[PDB]
Amino acid sequence: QSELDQLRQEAEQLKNQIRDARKACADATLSQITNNIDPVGRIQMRTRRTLRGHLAKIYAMHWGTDSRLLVSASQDGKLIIWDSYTTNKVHAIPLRSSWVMTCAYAPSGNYVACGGLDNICSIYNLKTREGNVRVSRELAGHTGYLSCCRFLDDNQIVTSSGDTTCALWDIETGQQTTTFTGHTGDVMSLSLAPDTRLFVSGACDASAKLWDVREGMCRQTFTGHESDINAICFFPNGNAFATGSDDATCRLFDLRADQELMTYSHDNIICGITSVSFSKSGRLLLAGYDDFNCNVWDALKADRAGVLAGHDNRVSCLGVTDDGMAVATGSWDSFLKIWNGSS
Amino acid sequence: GCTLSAEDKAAVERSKMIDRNLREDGEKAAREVKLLLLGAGESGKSTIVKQMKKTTGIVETHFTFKDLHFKMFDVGAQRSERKKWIHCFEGVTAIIFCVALSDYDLVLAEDEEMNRMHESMKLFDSICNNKWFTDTSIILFLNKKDLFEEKIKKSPLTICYPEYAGSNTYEEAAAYIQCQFEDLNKRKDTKEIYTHFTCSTDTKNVQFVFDAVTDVIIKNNLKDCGLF
């Protein structure tokens, strides 16, 4: 009606105002400013360890905060916790639903979360007096598949789902404390800020949204991608983040200037990005692709620095240890590989 | 030497036991038949799953027939982007696609000229030629044959198929629509469509799905053996 048309016109005017403000704050691209800096060398990494035991496509992995333990889920109904130093299997947790799409490790190391096509984020207690691992809580309330989950502390976890919403849960009560709405497509990944006061999420609507955890509102919305955003990661500083999308490009967005900074794309690359992860200092942006290998990017110059080609199937998982010591990659070939540089 | 402490060796032994358990579980899972159940909303898939055997996530029904173990995965409760999770079912033995023969007359809830049977045809076209199901056979169940037979006397197929040039009797129309559904397969060499008209007695269609999965298992073994 007339009211709806007026509201649409007002929304278009606000969008034009936002774009004009972004253009006004856009004077010099980050690529121009970094043109005088010394490029990194050819970043060569070797497979230090290969973790075997999964019998199906690995879908997610997460490092523990101690940079030694990690958890991985592989849709064979198993959540395996690995000692990455000795390739030992610390735990093998059987899952009720073998359609897991995500997994997480609590920063305290006491819990691991996982979820998938069952729309349930299951929390597992690792430190039990019985010596086994049990389901501490089963969070329900998402009407779409669980796509990502990240622990804030031992009692708070934020999940992203295919029902175009993200939910901040209270694990003790099992109830959704806050629901984040505004995405018009399936939310495919989220990344918590270093201080866990903010988090970004990338959705199939080719847009990323910055959410305030405490308030529950969408602070900012970043566009530019031409397809679904399957991966997101925060810059270690916390004032920027990177998105990996099906359009075979990675993009670095900054929060303060509210716009894109650089695109990490190559003509030889035509497959989408399934995972992104920054280096310890943020100089390197590692991204996993469907062409079975992970490409290392000079985050400050958009120049490809190295290739991690060791997987026979799509590289679905990525992760850099909290100390920057190593980067682990999971893949649909049922193997995880820990990579590291050489002097 | 060994350069392993007592606790390190005990942890290695625990990891070996975990590996043994994982191998046993993998063998058990490999000795199984996984079927993906698809179809429209009111396609009779609930009736089918009743004959074979809280959250609107995924529903797994586990049943056994003639020392063969099946796990059907009803996924119709997922309203999100299908292309974002359909690759999770790459390794399913077969896809059970259910369509309703009665839907050649009823129009969709939107009532925008999009026939329900046309929606089923679109879904079958999308699934059959999906990049993840190039070698996956499809067991097509044509549901509600009895009330379709009852309704075929009043309204013919001309409403849904303007190109239909056959008599409005039951068997000719059923064969026509079955051929149209089978003709959507652009991979007639790599995959086979096992079409069956579901009967009131469960045993007939459970036997049909058993035979179809046995045949596709033999064909997969032949493909892994160099033959075929």
Partner: single-chain antibody
Framework: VQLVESGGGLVQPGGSRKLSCSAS????????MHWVRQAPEKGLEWVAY????????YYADTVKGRFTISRDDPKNTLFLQMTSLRSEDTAMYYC??????????????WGQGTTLTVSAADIVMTQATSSVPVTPGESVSISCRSS???????????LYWFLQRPGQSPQLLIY???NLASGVPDRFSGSGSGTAFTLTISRLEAEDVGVYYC?????????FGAGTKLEL
Amino acid sequence: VQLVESGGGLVQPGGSRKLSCSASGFAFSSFGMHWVRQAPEKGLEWVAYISSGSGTIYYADTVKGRFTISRDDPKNTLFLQMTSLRSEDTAMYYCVRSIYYYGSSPFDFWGQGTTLTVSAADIVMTQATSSVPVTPGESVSISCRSSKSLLHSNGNTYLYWFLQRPGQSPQLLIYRMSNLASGVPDRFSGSGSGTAFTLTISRLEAEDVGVYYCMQHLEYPLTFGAGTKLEL
């Protein structure tokens, strides 16, 4: 978690006796199990060990060839078949559960004990002090020394501290020389580098009296200290 043992009593020397240990409240099959004896008015002495899955079995030298340790996982029982018992076997036998993985806490739970009475290159852990007078409110530091360096190449220092309250089974306080066991208040702390270790109990309070034992877990002939007694 509960471990109950039975089968003790008066045994003629040269005879045989079977000790049992029924477990409850925890995953028995996932835990390696130890037998630890304590002669009357003497310190602890490790006897035998059976791994999770019965894959690995170890014995002390004084019991090799006469004691057999076996487990029955389905019925959650641990056995110790003893043959040709000598008067030196008169002790109280404890059932100790112990799970091993990265960051694990072995020897965490001990059974109540069953009394047996027979009527007639190892690392040496030294606890020079045998009795220390204490007062409630002050801090008491207990010293320990080992013949070998317990610091392995992986960085772990395999030293364990146990508390045995009067008329009670030992309980774990510190594992691997620095990590406080679950259920232990922060008043207990451990230190040391390679061969000398100390356990300080700041703000000592009652019910902390009893014998404190040090155990090494570097080489499987596990050896306990003489035990330092804390008298109020």
